[PDB]
Amino acid sequence: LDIQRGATLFNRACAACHDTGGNIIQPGATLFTKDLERNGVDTEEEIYRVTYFGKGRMPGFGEKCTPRGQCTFGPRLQDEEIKLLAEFVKFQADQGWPT
Ligand code: HEC
């Protein structure tokens, strides 16, 4: 809901890999609606879950993400931050990642 706060957090925690909604590591697994839909995760609740726990080559960010090697070696994000990020991603995907 707070777009500017979500954008700021996204820019520092996510953008290097998901530049403008993309995926610089894994083609086909972007944050665009088409890929989110194909991968079964075009919802806020699914975006939150994958951000929290990770999946293959993406680290999880949740406080209770486990085991250690599947999660960020940087600081974990709080639930509220991951919720803001999931809402931001869903909103941006719905809008087509405006530039
Ligand atoms: C690189 C080190 C990444 C960072 C930092 C973040 N993500 Fe990521 N993400 C990355 C990869 C390699 C993948 C694909 C994983 C796979 O095996 O499928 C993803 C995937 C996502 C998805 C799902 C996209 C889809 O299925 O099309 C989402 C919703 C997602 N990532 C969100 C996300 C957020 C919110 C991040 C910051 C907190 C973030 N990612 C960081 C690589 C990387």
Side-chain angles (χ1 to χ4, degrees), residues 18-29:
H18 294 293
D19 56 356
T20 64
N23 192 322
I24 74 161
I25 301 304
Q26 185 165 329

Side-chain angles (χ1 to χ4, degrees), residues 13-14 17-18 23 25-26 29-31 35-36 39 41 47 50-51 55-58 61 85 89:
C14 317
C17 296
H18 294 293
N23 192 322
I25 301 304
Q26 185 165 329
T30 73
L31 311 185
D35 286 348
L36 293 169
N39 302 151
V41 298
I47 294 161
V50 71
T51 307
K55 172 188 182 49
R57 257 177 318 173
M58 183 174 145
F61 291 85
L85 285 165
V89 170

Side-chain angles (χ1 to χ4, degrees), residues 9 11 37 59 63 68 75-76 81 90 92 96:
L9 185 50
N11 288 347
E37 285 179 343
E63 294 288 351
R68 184 150 190 253
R76 306 300 172 85
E81 292 173 309
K90 181 56 168 59
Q92 286 292 94

Side-chain angles (χ1 to χ4, degrees), residues 20 91-93 95-99:
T20 64
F91 172 74
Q92 286 292 94
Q95 300 277 302
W97 288 93
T99 63

